[model samples]
Target: ACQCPDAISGWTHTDYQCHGLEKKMYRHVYAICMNGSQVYCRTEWGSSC
Candidate 1:
């Protein structure tokens, strides 16, 4: 799981493959942050951001 705990108001996001996983994986990837507040967590067979 991942997170950004500063309360961001302006930011950007990108989707990338999760490390150590098969290349066919999609939703199992990781996602991220900048200034304000944001939180990312691994979900059941997927991820949340």
Candidate 2:
């Protein structure tokens, strides 16, 4: 997949985290590959996550 600058590969997260800008972030349980920036929790489903 794409790339995330601060995301960890194979990371497992349950709760969603909010960024300073109020963007929600969560680890992808379905991802085969890790994109650090791909950690998302629904701001804009397609665009943000």
Candidate 3:
């Protein structure tokens, strides 16, 4: 799943994305924004941990 920011204001550039290679399993990819207020994952089935 994606980290839909609600309490957090602006993108901390400390989010992540995941690509499901198999069923529920996925490969996480780290991402960050330089000057932004929100972010999104190119893939799905991931978290912010």
Candidate 4:
């Protein structure tokens, strides 16, 4: 697995690259605050949480 971070348009961004047959898909879960001051993220694969 490989991960990288960067910034664009004042928003921080990241990239996740997974390898091998065990990892077959990518799921992104995210949330942002009503005030736009907070953020969260989560990732999952396969049928497992």
Q: Largest lDDT belongs to which candidate?
A: 1
- Assess each prediction's global lDDT (C-alpha) against the native: 0.43, 0.40, 0.40, 0.41
Task: Please tell me which model should have the higher TM-score, number 1 or number 3.
Answer: 1
- Write one digit per residue (lDDT tens) for candidate 1, span 1-49: 6655644344343454453554342333234446544554453333422
Q: Each prediction's TM-score against the native?
A: 0.22, 0.20, 0.20, 0.34
Q: Which stretches in model 1 have alpha-carbon errors above 4 Å? A: 8-26, 35-40, 46-49
- lDDT at 3 for candidate 2? 40
Error of 2 at 41 (Å): 12
Which candidate wins on TM-score? 4
Q: How high is the lDDT of residue 43 in model 3?
A: 44
1 against 4, candidate with superior TM-score: 4
**Per-residue lDDT of candidate 3, residues 6-42 (tens digit):** 4334432333434344434244333344333444444
Instruction: Give the true-structure RMSD of model 1.
Output: 7.1
Off by over 4 Å in 3: 1-22, 27-30, 36-38, 44-49
RMSD of 2: 9.1
List per-candidate RMSD values in Å: 7.1, 9.1, 9.4, 9.7
Q: Write the per-residue lDDT of candidate 4 for residues 1-49, one digit (tens) a residue.
A: 2222432112332344453555555555444444444233556554321
Of candidates 2 and 1, the better by TM-score:
1
Q: Write model 2 residue lDDT over 1-49, tens digit each, in one string.
A: 3345555465343444444464555333422234434343323222242
Query: Any runs in candidate 4 off by more than 4 Å, and if so which?
Result: 1-22, 47-49
